[model samples]
Target: ELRVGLEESELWLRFKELTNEMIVTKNGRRMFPVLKVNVSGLDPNAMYSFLLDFVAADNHRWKYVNGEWVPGGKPEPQAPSCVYIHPDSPNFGAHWMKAPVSFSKVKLTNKLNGGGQIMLNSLHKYEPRIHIVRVGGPQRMITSHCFPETQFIAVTAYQNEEITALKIKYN
Candidate 1:
C-alpha cells in the first residue's frame, strides 16, 4: 500500500516570515519555529524513512527575535550527530497519510554535540526540510516507505512570544 495525498507533494516550503529562523554558527542555534505535518495515504503495513535538514535564505546575517529581523554577526554551525527516525512508523506510506504528524524539530544549538551550531545570523531567516524514505516491504507488520519523495508544505516558525514565552496549553 502506498500514499498519495497531502504528504505526497514532494518538498517542504519552510516559510520563515512570521517565524523564527535558524542560524549556522560555529555554535549551532536551536530551531524555535518548528515544522509540523499531517500525512494521509498509507497502507498501514510497510517500512519508511524520515529525514529532516536545514537550508539558508541567501547569504545575509540577521537575527530572528521579537517577530522581527536583526543583524547577524556569528559564524555558522555544523551537524555532526545522528538524527533518529520516528519509531512510530508502522509501515511506509501505508499509515503515513492516515493522520497528522509533527516532525521532530531540527534544533540549532551552540552545543558541540554534532547537530548543534546552526550557521546563522542573530535575526536572519532560514528554512528547514523533512524527507521520508521507504524500506521495501510486504513481509510482517506494516512498515517502510516507497516512491518516497520529501514533500514540502513548508513554513518557517519562530521562538515563543515575548508576552508569554512560557505559556502552556493542554489539549
Candidate 2:
C-alpha cells in the first residue's frame, strides 16, 4: 500500500453531506475546494508523475428537483475521459513525500483546452480518479485510487443556497 490519504476531508464531508455540486464553465472553473491529497510510500530518489481524471460513476444523469436530486435522463455521450497533469510532475519521489501535494493549477471544465484542464459533462455522475505513475525499477509501477468523499455532480450554476454559501465562504 502506498498509504494514499485524503486532505481536507473535513471540508469535503461538509460539502458532500448535502450532495456536493461542483460548478463548471466555458473558460474552466476551479473546484470550490480543489483536490489536495497526501501521499506516502515513495522511493526517495525515484521518479513519479500524478494526474487526475473523471469517471462516470453510473449510467444515469441527475438533475436537482427542488431540494432533491432526480433522474433526469440517460447520460449524454461523453468525450473520452480527460486527464489533468500536476504542474510539478515527473519529480523525485522525495519531492512528493516532502509535503502535502495539491494541484490548484488544474481546472475542471466542459470544453477541451490546450492545457491540462479536464472536461466533464454537466449533470453526470463524475468520480475523480488519481493516477500515480512511479518509476524506479525496470518494471513500471502505476497505481490509481479515488476518494468517495470527493465525488460531486458537475453544475454550471449553484443549485443550493447552502452550497453557494459554502463555496463563497471558503473562497
Spell out the clash pairs found in candidate 2. none
TM-score of 1: 0.48
The digit string of per-residue lDDT tens for model 2 on 1-171 reads: 587888899999999888889887888888767888899988878898988888887767888887887876555565557788788988998898888788687777877766667788888877777898976658788899888888888899878778889988887
| Whole-model lDDT values for every prediction | 0.40, 0.82
Q: Locate the minimum summed-lDDT window of 10 residues in model 2.
A: 71-80
Off by over 4 Å in 2: 73-80
Clash count, one per candidate: 72, 0
Model 1 / residue 25 / CA error / Å: 12
lDDT of 1 at 79: 31
In model 2, the number of clashes is 0
